[PDB]
Structure formats: structure tokens, C-alpha cells
Amino acid sequence: DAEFRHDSGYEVHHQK
Ligand SMILES: [Zn+2]
């Protein structure tokens, strides 16, 4: 959750 706190809304910047 440290980085992935947008699990309920994945976006482009969150590409990994
Ligand atoms: Zn994000």
C-alpha cells in the first residue's frame, strides 16, 4: 500500500 494506494483506481503514472 506504500506505493499502491490507488488500488481502487489504477492510473497511467502507476504503471509498474
Ligand atoms: Zn496512482
Curated annotation (Swiss-Prot):
Specify the glycosylation sites in chain numbering: 10
| Binding-site residues for Zn(2+) 2, renumbered to this chain | 6, 10, 13-14
Which residues are involved in binding Cu(2+) 2? 6, 10, 13-14
The listed locations are:
Cell surface
Per the UniProt entry, the effect of residue 5 to G is: 60-70% zinc-induced amyloid-beta protein 28 aggregation
Q: Site feature Cleavage: at which residues?
A: 1-2, 7-8
Residue stretches in coiled coil? none
**Domain of life the protein comes from:** Eukaryota
Listed under subunit, the entry gives: Interacts with S100A9.
Q: What is this protein called?
A: Amyloid-beta protein 40
Residues included from the entire protein:
672 to 687 of 770
